Amino acid sequence: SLPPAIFLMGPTAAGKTDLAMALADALPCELISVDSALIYRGMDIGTAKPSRELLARYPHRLIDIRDPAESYSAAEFRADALAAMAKATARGRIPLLVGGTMLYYKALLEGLPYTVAQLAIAPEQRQVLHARIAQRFRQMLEQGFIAEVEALHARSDLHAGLPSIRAVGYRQVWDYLDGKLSYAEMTERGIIATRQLAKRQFTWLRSWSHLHWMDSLAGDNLPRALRYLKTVSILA
Numbered sequence: 001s002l003p004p005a006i007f008l009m010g011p012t013a014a015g016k017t018d019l020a021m022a023l024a025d026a027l028p029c030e031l032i033s034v035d036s037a038l039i040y041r042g043m044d045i046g047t048a049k050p051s052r053e054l055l056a057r058y059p060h061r062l063i064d065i066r067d068p069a070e071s072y073s074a075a076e077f078r079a080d081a082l083a084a085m086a087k088a089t090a091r092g093r094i095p096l097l098v099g100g101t102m103l104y105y106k107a108l109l110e111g112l113p114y115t116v117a118q119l120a121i122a123p124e125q126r127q128v129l130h131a132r133i134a135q136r137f138r139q140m141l142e143q144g145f146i147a148e149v150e151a152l153h154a155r156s157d158l159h160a161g162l163p164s165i166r167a168v169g170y171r172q173v174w175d176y177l178d179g180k181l182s183y184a185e186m187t188e189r190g191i192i193a194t195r196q197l198a199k200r201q202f203t204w205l206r207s208w209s210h211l212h213w214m215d216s217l218a219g220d221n222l223p224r225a226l227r228y229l230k231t232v233s234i235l236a
């Protein structure tokens with residue numbers, strides 16, 4: 001009789017964090033981030049990290065747990081997630097792992113003493129996701145993405161080749177700061193990189209079994225999700 005757990009994956013910008021918070025208000029959950037970039041402190045705007053205020057009312061595990069000068073392996077995620085899941089479970093809370101880093105989920109499922117319900121969200125038309133990706137990136141620039149990266153760029157202990165700087169978009173802003181690119185080239189290439197990420201995520205997901213999809217444009221995802229729980233043998 002393995003305790004319950006929820007997986008909420010999908011491409012970047014699909015609306016995973018949004019739905020997770022919604023679900024966090026419907027059931028006793030423990031939000032656990034599954035994102036290789038959100039682990040880094042000081043990388044909030046460019047990574048679409050939930051605001052300080054939102055995190056206060058929707059605490060996430062595995063967020064701001066590492067300095068940008070540090071590395072983080074899928075193996076460390078593995079141990080960290082298992083720890084967070086056991087801790088949440090002992091409290092009666094349902095582990096809700098939400099994120100788009102597929103290698104992490106993979107590491108957990110393979111390398112799980114839980115009855116896992118797997119959800120995935122994305123638009124039916126990929127063109128819709130691309131438009132959002134482009135617009136969200138432009139918003140990041142307005143919210144201070146460049147100044148955010150300037151602070152990293154100014155650290156002598158950081159360089160463009162580090163795992164943290166590989167977070168999509170950061171390398172482009174970094175090169176801009178090095179004066180290698182124009183503002184336009186930085187924007188376009190940053191959007192391309194993110195679109196490339198979404199493509200890699202769809203490839204992981206398309207061959208992913210036991211997934212219950214949902215539409216990013218749907219407005220009744222909350223009730224739709226709460227209903228699936230029973231299907232995979234889970235009494236909520």
Ligand SMILES: [Mg+2]
Nearest residue numbers: 016017018048
């Ligand atoms: Mg998110």
